[PDB]
From a paper:
The array of μ1 and σ3 is interrupted at the fivefold axes by pentameric λ2 turrets which enzymatically cap the mRNA transcripts produced by the polymerase on egress from the particle. Here we demonstrate that vitrification of infected cells followed by cryo-focussed ion beam (cryo-FIB) milling and cryo-electron tomography (cryo-ET) allows high resolution reconstruction of assembly intermediates of a mammalian reovirus, allowing atomic models to be constructed which throw light on some of these fundamental questions.
In addition virion-like particles of two types, ‘empty’ and ‘full’, were observed. For stars, analysis focused on the fivefold regions using emClarity16 yielded a reconstruction at 6.6 Å. For the empty virion-like particles, reconstructions focused on the fivefold regions and pseudo sixfold regions yielded reconstructions at 6.5 and 5.6 Å respectively. Thus purified virus particles provide a good model for the in-cell empty virion-like particle indicating that the internal RNA does not alter the fundamental organisation of the structure, thus at the fivefold axis on the exterior of the particle, there is evidence for the σ1 spike being attached. It is possible that these termini play a role in interactions with, and possibly organising, the genome in the mature virus. The observation of only the SLP and completely assembled virion-like particles suggests that the conversion from the SLP to a virus-type structure occurs through the relatively rapid addition of all the remaining structural components of the virus.
Residue numbers in the entry:
A (entry chain B): 241 to 1275
B (entry chain O): 216 to 429
C (entry chain P): 2 to 418
Amino acid sequence: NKKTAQLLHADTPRLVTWDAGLCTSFKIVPIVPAQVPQDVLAYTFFTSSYAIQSPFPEAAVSRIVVHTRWASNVDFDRDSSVIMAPPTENNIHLFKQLLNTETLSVRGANPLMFRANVLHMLLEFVLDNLYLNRHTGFSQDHTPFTEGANLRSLPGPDAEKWYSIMYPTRMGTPNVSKICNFVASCVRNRVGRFDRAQMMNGAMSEWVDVFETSDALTVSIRGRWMARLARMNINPTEIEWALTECAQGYVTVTSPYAPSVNRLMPYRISNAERQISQIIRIMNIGNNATVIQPVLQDISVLLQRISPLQIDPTIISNTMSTVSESTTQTLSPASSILGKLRPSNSDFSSFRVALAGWLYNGVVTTVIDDSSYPKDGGSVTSLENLWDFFILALALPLTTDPCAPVKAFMTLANMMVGFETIPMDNQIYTQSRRASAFSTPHTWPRCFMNIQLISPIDAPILRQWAEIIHRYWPNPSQIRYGAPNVFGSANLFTPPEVLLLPIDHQPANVTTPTLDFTNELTNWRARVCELMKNLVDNQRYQPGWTQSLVSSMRGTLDKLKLIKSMTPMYLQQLAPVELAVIAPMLPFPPFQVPYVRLDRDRVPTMVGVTRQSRDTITQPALSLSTTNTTVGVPLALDARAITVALLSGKYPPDLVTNVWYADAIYPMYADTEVFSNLQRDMITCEAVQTLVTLVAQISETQYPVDRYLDWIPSLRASAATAATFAEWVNTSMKTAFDLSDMLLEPLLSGDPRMTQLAIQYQQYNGRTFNVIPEMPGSVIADCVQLTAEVFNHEYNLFGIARGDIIIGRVQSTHLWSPLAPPPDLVFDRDTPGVHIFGRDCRISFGMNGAAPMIRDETGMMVPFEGNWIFPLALWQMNTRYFNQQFDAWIKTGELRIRIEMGAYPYMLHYYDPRQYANAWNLTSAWLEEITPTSIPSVPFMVPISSDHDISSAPAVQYIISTEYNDRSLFCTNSSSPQTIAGPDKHIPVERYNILTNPDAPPTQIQLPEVVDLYNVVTRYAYETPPITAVVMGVP
Amino acid sequence: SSAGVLVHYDKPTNGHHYLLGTLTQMVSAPPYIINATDAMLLESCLEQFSANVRARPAQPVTRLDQCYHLRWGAQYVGEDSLTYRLGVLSLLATNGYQLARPIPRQLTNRWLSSFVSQIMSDGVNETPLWPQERYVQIAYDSPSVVDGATQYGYVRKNQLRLGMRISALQSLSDTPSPVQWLPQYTIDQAAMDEGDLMVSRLTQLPLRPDYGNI
Amino acid sequence: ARAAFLFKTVGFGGLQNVPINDELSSHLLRAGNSPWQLTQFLDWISLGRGLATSALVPTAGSRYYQMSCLLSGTLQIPFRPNHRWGDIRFLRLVWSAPTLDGLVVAPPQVLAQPALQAQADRVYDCDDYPFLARDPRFKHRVYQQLSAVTLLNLTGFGPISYVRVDEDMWSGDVNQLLMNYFGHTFAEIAYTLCQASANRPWEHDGTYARMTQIILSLFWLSYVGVIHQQNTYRTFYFQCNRRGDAAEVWILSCSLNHSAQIRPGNRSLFVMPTSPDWNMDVNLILSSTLTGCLCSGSQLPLIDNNSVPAVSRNIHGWTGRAGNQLHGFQVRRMVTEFCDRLRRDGVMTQAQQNQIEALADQTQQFKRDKLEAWAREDDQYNQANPNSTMFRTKPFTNAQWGRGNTGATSAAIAALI
């Protein structure tokens, strides 16, 4: 139901927000409270004593993390962000969510969807962070802590927290804690605002530059956003001119001449984009016109709203009254021809249907009811025949059926058969087959375009017929339309900005109505009337035909010339102007076919279009040579009413061209269609390119194709899975940009792994003609790629572990991180007593109290211990057995297994260091529940830290990673002269060199460096006024 | 442009102007449909022929050249067209080439159609040139000075050397009689049955001759 | 105006081939197939108040430089005496169009084929290939960036503004159009112009010609600081008070205090710098962008052959036999002269210019060091790279860290009122 709607309007867009809080999406999670308070420690070491907020609370574990929507206000949220949990908790279900085809587990999944899942994570955090920043407050400081600055103030409530927190700068106290000498690194001269804008007295800034606890990514993203947006702004003058030249030089809007401060309005884009979007519209409409009927009606409406046309039967009536006589004859041809009139009730409309058909011509043909036809031969003894036939004669130059005068002549042919006939060498069809039955010029004989093939007395009639036609069949011309910088162009069958017409245009000579009677239509009906005259001058139509009937039919056709309908010049001159002016007001730009007058040699035949290819051919020339999109449809209509319309001209006597248009257009110039269309379809094509780029991270293609993260388990699969991913994205999107269209249809149709947009047509002699687009820019792609590469080094920063692990007897007394490397006990595939494994399996037997063993791929004989290298995937064969074989043999048996997963999420488990025990339970569990698709996030058993030293204690642990990833740890135990126990971490130099380093520029980029979280931003003090408040709309 | 964009450069008093044709073509001159574009072209061709007939150190035309070469339209039909052929011949006769059959003052309608019949055939051009809307060439030293006055659409290949001697005629007419000729041999050889098989598609045999008197 | 259109293909100071590697294209062709990457090129500025930086491309210096290297490689194929399109690799490169558009990986057969050889200094005409030679419009369109390449290519040094001052640039429609952008950042209207010609370059003597003339002219005046709050050009002048840094935002202003007069006499000149630090600046790139259109709509003067390297002389499209030799400088002494004659006017104090110079030349130092360091790194790369070759930017020399030769040029470009 939304299809014509998609040709009617768009959903409400969202382009501007105003961040009434914070932009960056990160807070620290301090989760594990410290061992405090210790006793000989005086309470003098903390701030909860004299109560001013610390920028960071103290905790035994504290790490920076992303969190969306915890510090910011908006009048509008932006569609379902992503946040995670500490490494002590599991969000993993994501991975058992939205794509898995089989699941049962709470801890474990198919390694397949993995890359896809983190992909989704990426793109959704791409999604959420697009808000727009309203420049933020200020207020002069009053305690000499600061430089008395204008602190960035929140005009909303409860801002003192951030002051305390964003500014350990603002912090200062005699004490030596981590934070103390940490912040000692900062200076005081580069705080808060960097700069601003100011002019136009009685105002705030026009833009500002200030320092904020802030990332770089969202900054970069939304700035890119802002910029691409800004690529489309306008200034009054051109909008004024749009009005004007489209106002027919009559109605006014005036441009400002006063000082311009700032008036933002990003709308206008390049032409190719709207071209191709509407092109896709044209794609996904194949083979139905029930959609077209509404707009046809609407056209007739809006044109009826603008025309001084009146329809009148009375002319017909008084005219046909043309006889005075004594009555004994056989017939009254008066009432006969009247049979077409039916001497009002109730003619209202439907003259303009095929006329519109001219204006969207490129797609449909116009015809009339075969029911209107007398399908019954003819005889001059029946002038009903000639009446109807002439009705048809009228209709024909108003008909777009590609056989119009063909069928005209064909009537005649069907009539005088055996009295008069034409040349022919084919009986595929003969002269005795009717209309709606003869289409191609290759159905039209040589004689059909060769008047020489008959003697002009053997059949003078048809000879003069073809001759007349060749000399007089109506002549076409053309005209321009609209303004390109406000409307663009959809004309592709023709040089840009042209608009043909089956008719020749004739300008008028004065602003009044014009009394015009030399029209090729005037002359045209005159032609066919005299043709009838000459016809009936036959010697043979008077062995019983009367002088009375003679003068009757003479004066018949004569007064048929004597008609004074006011439509001919009407449509010949200024109705074209009605067309030109509706064109913009008309939604859904057109496509019309180029025309012939007599040509039968350049008619187009077919249309062929691709959205994708199946072969190694990429050159669109040879590519579309088999891909295709052809639709073709008739529209049957009336000949009676339309002929009448030709035959019924009556207009108001006070009608005058100029003033009528002047008044009429004026109300009729509120139009907002195009802007909404631009927004929607811009977003549309961007979705195209973004989506296919996503795909590109899954598949291979003749397209330039590369991927970098593939080491994450995921592989190609069916088109089913493909479109699965695809529509998941689409739904995320329609959420994100908040509209409710139908979209991606061509992409949700066949093979999306490859695309091609070539659009062509075939002619009377092949000679096809085609077009393909080049895309505009697409920042979101750049963004998401950059992010993929960000996380290409910041995985663990999100609980994401690369590398692998090793299960082994870890029995010692020294305290050191399982995520640290062994002081002395590293193991891999290069040690003695290491073994890698094929499917070699032969278990020995310990009965006979003998030496039990297992057979190596070597072929040796092996007990259960050593340094071994195994594909856990094999463990998942009959893991029941597997576990049963080695549970104890690893428990206190001393085998060592370097083992592979590649990548995963993990799990944390803290505990008192001041005691000892074993970690065998989750050992057993996390082992046993392996399936080919069950894999709990890797557990980890680490004690908890302190401030000082102790005597040591026993320790028994099992497994270690392969690579370092403890970056995620941000810091621990702030209010401390140091963290002694465990390791110690510190607020990384990698985060605030803005002030710690005095030599950094105002801007700097940490790529792929561990990024900052305090950053300078330019907050936008722009204002984007509405499109009507500036423009003075005046008659 | 697809309705025919042709121009004669050499200045009329008409002045700067271009031209398009309409959607009509001549049925007459059996057996040809005739799109007036190429028709008026043929007329220009006749002009150039008439030109090439004589050669006098004062042939007081005002313009040797009046024909029209494609200003626009080269984007709908290739070089194998009859029309491209015509324009070739246009610039050729512009050089000064001329038919190798006696030429009527007015060359019959059917003369024209027969001409068409001929040229339309298979074969090649004698003239390598292929002109351009990018530019139209100036011959080696063809005796005409229209180049000597204009640039607009004109670039000579100074490299050009493909020329001929000079020759024309003072009388061209007809005779009925099958008249004499004498052979003047050459040097090389050939193969016999092969010449037989050659003539096997050329003979006038078989026919009854006028036996005449013995 | 101009119906003749040519270009040239880059040479090398010692490379046997193209230094372009597919990686570059890919990370650019991540989207689309365009030969010009105008959109994110321009948007890659990061608003220009700061730059965008990567290992692959730290500067739009690097960005456009490899853009050039790429397109130099690209043009190789279709453009020959034997013109053509399709099925011959240039590092697996294939177009998909007779208009020579689209860019994807070579077909399997074409993956195996040898790539088309290249040659240096390959000047050609932009009018030979027939297809586009039928569409004037896309031809013009491409030409405005063929020029952007060419001009920077023609010299062993950087870009050049062809500044021009002429009166008729005052007209009613003109100051009208002017009025549209008061209190406006140069960069944004530059964007607007990129738009308003990327759609369609305006016609030869377009209103917008005189406009952009005003734009670049007033720009460079403020740049040297020619005009100011009192010395005003029909009372208009940009600003950016944050001077002393690698980012400026010069913005329209009107001064109701004193106005300076334009004597009759049309003038113009051609400016380059001599410090390869411009990679932080953008304004040069936009000036290039627009001057390309100025050429593609208006036939413009040419420079002396001696003004350019001998091998690159006598070019119909660019190298005439006369025309004002270039104008070079360095931003360091540029802002020096700038602030100095400004205080000469007595609208300052000394310590003002002094504290300017301090931070300015500090930044100069740091970023030159970074430049040279990245140079060293790239060298070591080449040493490790026998086959995957490249230059991030146009290779340079320390010999380019001295005189601006700008001395008399000060008064010269100053006497253009």
